[PDB]
Amino acid sequence: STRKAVIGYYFIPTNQINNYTETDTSVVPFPVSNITPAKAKQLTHINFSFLDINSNLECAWDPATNDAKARDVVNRLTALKAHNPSLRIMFSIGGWYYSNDLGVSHANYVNAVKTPAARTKFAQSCVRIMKDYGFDGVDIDWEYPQAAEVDGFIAALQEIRTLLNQQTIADGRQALPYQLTIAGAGGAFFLSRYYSKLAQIVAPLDYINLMTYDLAGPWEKITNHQAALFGDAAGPTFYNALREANLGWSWEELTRAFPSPFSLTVDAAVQQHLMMEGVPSAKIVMGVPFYGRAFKGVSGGNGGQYSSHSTPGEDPYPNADYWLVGCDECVRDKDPRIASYRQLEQMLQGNYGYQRLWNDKTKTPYLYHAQNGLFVTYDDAESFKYKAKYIKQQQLGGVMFWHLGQDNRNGDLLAALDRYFNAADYDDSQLDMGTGLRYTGVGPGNLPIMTAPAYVPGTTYAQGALVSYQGYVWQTKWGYITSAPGSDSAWLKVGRLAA
Numbered sequence: 001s002t003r004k005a006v007i008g009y010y011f012i013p014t015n016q017i018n019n020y021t022e023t024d025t026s027v028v029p030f031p032v033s034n035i036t037p038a039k040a041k042q043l044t045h046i047n048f049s050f051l052d053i054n055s056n057l058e059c060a061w062d063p064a065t066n067d068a069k070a071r072d073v074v075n076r077l078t079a080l081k082a083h084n085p086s087l088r089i090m091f092s093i094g095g096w097y098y099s100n101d102l103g104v105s106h107a108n109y110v111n112a113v114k115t116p117a118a119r120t121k122f123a124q125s126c127v128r129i130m131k132d133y134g135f136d137g138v139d140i141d142w143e144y145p146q147a148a149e150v151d152g153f154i155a156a157l158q159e160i161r162t163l164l165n166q167q168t169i170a171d172g173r174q175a176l177p178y179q180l181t182i183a184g185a186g187g188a189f190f191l192s193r194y195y196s197k198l199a200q201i202v203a204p205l206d207y208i209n210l211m212t213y214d215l216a217g218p219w220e221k222i223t224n225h226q227a228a229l230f231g232d233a234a235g236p237t238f239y240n241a242l243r244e245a246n247l248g249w250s251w252e253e254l255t256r257a258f259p260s261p262f263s264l265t266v267d268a269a270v271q272q273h274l275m276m277e278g279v280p281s282a283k284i285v286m287g288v289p290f291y292g293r294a295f296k297g298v299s300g301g302n303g304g305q306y307s308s309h310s311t312p313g314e315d316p317y318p319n320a321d322y323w324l325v326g327c328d329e330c331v332r333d334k335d336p337r338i339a340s341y342r343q344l345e346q347m348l349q350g351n352y353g354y355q356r357l358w359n360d361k362t363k364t365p366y367l368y369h370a371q372n373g374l375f376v377t378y379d380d381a382e383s384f385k386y387k388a389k390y391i392k393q394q395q396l397g398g399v400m401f402w403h404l405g406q407d408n409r410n411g412d413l414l415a416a417l418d419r420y421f422n423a424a425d426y427d428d429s430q431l432d433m434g435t436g437l438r439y440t441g442v443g444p445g446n447l448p449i450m451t452a453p454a455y456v457p458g459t460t461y462a463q464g465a466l467v468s469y470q471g472y473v474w475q476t477k478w479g480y481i482t483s484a485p486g487s488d489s490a491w492l493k494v495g496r497l498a499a
């Protein structure tokens with residue numbers, strides 16, 4: 001049917017732009033020339049990261065950026081479109097460093113969306129940047145607007161959308177229209193900031209790119225998979241913050257949608273989006289990490305899973321103990337807590353003491369270093385089989401990943417994703433999705449199809465009775481009920497009738 005989106009972020013820090021070279025990996029580890037024609041054909045979007053919002057409340061490059069070098073790098077990316085007429089080079093505004101609550105530019109995000117006049121100035125600057133540098137759309141990665149900033153954020157997205165649509169007409173770009181996307185939270189605590197207005201946030205977007213990773217890390221006391229597809233009952237569980245969002249729903253409605261505690265998984269985040277009315281599955285893009293998160297000080301028994309650990313959370317990494325054995329990139333980056341898939345392959349292949357283990361509930365791999373007590377959670381071509389099948393089964397828009405420089409040299413992770421979506425000879429009809437814990441919540445936007453006897457006036461219905469009435473299947477919350485379903489508080493809408 002419709003091709004699945006494959007959205008790869010291209011992350012290049014300012015110092016690498018200013019010293020850009022394609023022949024010295026100690027200066028630029030992943031230059032644009034490493035995105036070969038074959039890789040360009042497997043991507044639908046490359047998202048250049050990151051631009052910012054400056055104190056003038058406009059989209060802007062980092063002011064330390066050499067503009068001539070910046071244009072040269074972007075030009076190399078947009079030249080890739082010669083190999084793929086569906087490919088878009090987006091640019092992304094924000095990222096954790098600029099836009100987190102304590103980030104260096106945070107107040108500029110709050111203020112740029114605060115008023116109609118600020119939103120107009122900001123929205124115009126976005127489109128100006130995208131036309132001036134040759135980008136194909138705008139991606140916003142503010143992590144994250146708070147519940148009170150959400151209305152301004154929504155209006156800013158609406159205003160950018162209108163201007164982009166004007167630009168599509170002006171440039172006759174109907175075959176490849178300019179797009180607007182955001183990177184969204186992939187876990188319930190950050191998602192709760194804007195969850196109640198999710199339909200308004202998604203309406204002006206082509207896609208919402210869920211960051212369904214970083215679900216574990218040094219900030220948690222217990223090691224865990226950072227991107228489990230489904231839940232493991234032996235793993236940690238979390239309070240479901242969505243049940244406290246300002247939804248106006250009843251106790252039964254909240255309980256049916258927001259089981260708590262719950263397993264913090266990719267499936268949970270996807271279902272939490274689908275549960276809301278007006279959030280179409282085709283706009284939801286599942287993020288996947290091309291890096292692993294590493295922990296030290298883990299005590300064995302379960303391959304390092306669900307263990308206490310002694311991994312610092314500070315930034316910069318607080319000392320020079322680069323304890324992730326074999327991680328040469330970690331020495332370069334002065335941080336043993338993150339390793340690219342590229343590096344993880346070499347760590348597993350070398351004489352470094354890792355076992356590769358597999359959790360058949362979460363459908364994810366992990367590395368365990370028994371001698372030193374190390375645990376690494378990551379994703380690979382095998383976990384991507386289950387995630388790609390889930391994307392197809394749930395009719396999602398596609399996949400997103402952070403970031404291109406972390407795939408191995410041959411681009412095997414990207415090639416795998418492309419194969420699972422597009423290869424005629426690839427068959428996952430027999431791929432067993434396992435018995436891991438599914439997120440069981442149901443909301444107005446994902447009512448299952450059900451059948452039930454028609455409601456009959458005068459009949460006294462016990463608690464739990466199911467009837468069909470005016471297009472839906474309803475269940476009594478208590479008994480005995482005689483009211484017509486939907487006329488009072490006694491009936492829960494639990495399903496839809498097939499047309």
Ligand SMILES: CC(=O)N[C@H]1[C@H](O[C@H]2[C@@H](O)[C@@H](NC(C)=O)[C@H](O[C@H]3[C@H](O)[C@H]4N=C(N(C)C)O[C@H]4[C@@H]3CO)O[C@@H]2CO)O[C@H](CO)[C@@H](O)[C@H]1O
Pocket residue numbers: 009012013014050092094095096097098141183211214315316338401402
């Ligand atoms: C250019 C720069 O600011 N470098 C910073 C550095 O910032 C990076 C790192 O913190 C990245 N962390 C990891 C594990 O890669 C971080 O990546 C985030 C990104 O911000 C989020 N946005 C997405 N999208 C898909 C849109 O994914 C996430 C990823 C993965 O979590 O990106 C920031 C830049 O925002 O941080 C260090 C420490 O402060 C700093 O020294 C400097 O090198």
Ligand SMILES: CC(=O)N[C@H]1[C@H](O[C@H]2[C@@H](O)[C@@H](NC(C)=O)[C@H](O[C@H]3[C@H](O)[C@H]4N=C(N(C)C)O[C@H]4[C@@H]3CO)O[C@@H]2CO)O[C@H](CO)[C@@H](O)[C@H]1O
Pocket residue numbers: 096097143184185186187188189190191211212213214215216217218219313314315
């Ligand atoms: C204390 C610490 O180590 N701070 C890190 C910082 O960690 C952040 C980010 O990695 C967030 N990643 C995002 C926003 O993409 C991370 O958010 C993850 C989060 O942990 C998962 N959990 C949720 N919840 C709702 C609980 O959602 C997902 C999100 C992704 O949506 O939160 C941690 C801790 O706050 O990362 C930066 C850059 O990597 C690093 O410099 C350092 O400051």
